[PDB]
């Protein structure tokens, strides 16, 4: 009944900043794996640079690190993180209008829950192409 509660109702009704934090991988560390499957030059006791290893490197995503190269042998333990990185990075309920309306059902890529719009010719380019084809 007090002004404190009167304010609190709407103050708590307020929304809060949201961020999609990927689940960590305490047991599996791509940063630690970076050194896996590497030869060691003994004259300096240091990892030997390996262009073949770099080419084979499977790039695991991460929010703190833009990429993490891991040898393709152990990539199978990061499948869930790959889906999390590929998805829309927000609750679907916030973008489900794309699924609901027909135009976006054809104009958006819904693979792995992504909601990134596909390429779409502008009206000027559409008219140019039609006129070039004479139709």
């Amino acid at each position: 009944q007090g002004m404190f509660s009167h304010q609190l109702k709407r103050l708590l009704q307020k929304k809060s900043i949201h961020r999609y934090n990927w689940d960590p991988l305490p047991m599996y560390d791509p940063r630690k794996l970076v050194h896996a499957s590497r030869h060691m030059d003994v004259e300096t006791w240091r990892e030997v640079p390996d262009p073949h290893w770099d080419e084979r490197s499977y790039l695991v995503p991460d929010q703190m690190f833009y990429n993490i190269p891991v040898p393709p042998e152990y990539k199978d333990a990061y499948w869930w993180r790959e889906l999390q990185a590929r998805r829309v990075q927000c609750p679907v309920e916030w973008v489900s209008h794309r699924m609901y309306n027909k135009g976006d059902r054809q104009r958006y890529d819904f693979q792995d829950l992504a909601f990134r719009k596909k390429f779409e010719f502008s009206y000027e380019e559409v008219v140019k192409n039609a006129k070039d084809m004479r139709s």
């Binding site: 002004m3 304010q7 109702k9 709407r10 103050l11 009704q13 307020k14 900043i17």
Partner: protein, 165 residues
């Protein structure tokens, strides 16, 4: 079940309908909403480094004292220290009174006075925050000045002002 096929696929407004987050209260006991919304972050980014048009500054520059907000707050300080005229207009008082932003501390105020107005004879300062004065215009709109902090300073020697009648 019910006859759901008869209804258009829209969302009924919930009962009760939630009130807007905007704090319509402007009294003494007004509080600051601790909840942070993404609009605040967006506005801060846009103000700091013109997001999204301009590329983001590097993390080192952002976290260093050379980042524009900190650099400006240091070199070109923006702090208003008002003086209660009636306190010293014609009354000789050993303890004048100032109004300062709530951010400033007693030490910060002392440094401000020492390095700007050259008031180096400060003994002590009593600080008390106050809500911005509330008033209603002719239409009744509840306006409210910004909150301030009354700082009662003490000086070694009395100071006064003279106003010719």
């Amino acid at each position: 079940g019910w006859r759901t096929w008869e209804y258009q696929h829209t969302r009924p407004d919930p009962r009760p309908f939630p009130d807007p987050p905007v704090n319509d209260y402007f009294g003494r006991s007004r509080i600051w909403n601790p909840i942070a919304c993404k609009l605040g972050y967006v506005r801060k980014k846009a103000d700091e480094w013109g997001w999204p048009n301009k590329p983001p500054p590097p993390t080192g520059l952002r976290y260093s004292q050379e980042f524009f907000p900190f650099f400006f707050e240091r070199y070109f300080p923006d702090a208003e220290v008002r003086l209660l005229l009636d306190s010293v207009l014609n009354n000789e008082t050993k303890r004048p009174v100032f109004q300062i932003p709530c951010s400033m501390s007693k030490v910060e105020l002392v440094n401000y006075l020492k390095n700007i107005y050259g008031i180096d004879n400060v003994v002590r300062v009593e600080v008390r925050n106050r809500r911005g004065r509330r008033y209603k215009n002719e239409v009744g709109e509840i306006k409210m000045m910004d909150d301030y902090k009354v700082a009662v300073v003490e000086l070694d020697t009395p100071v006064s002002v003279e106003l010719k009648q």
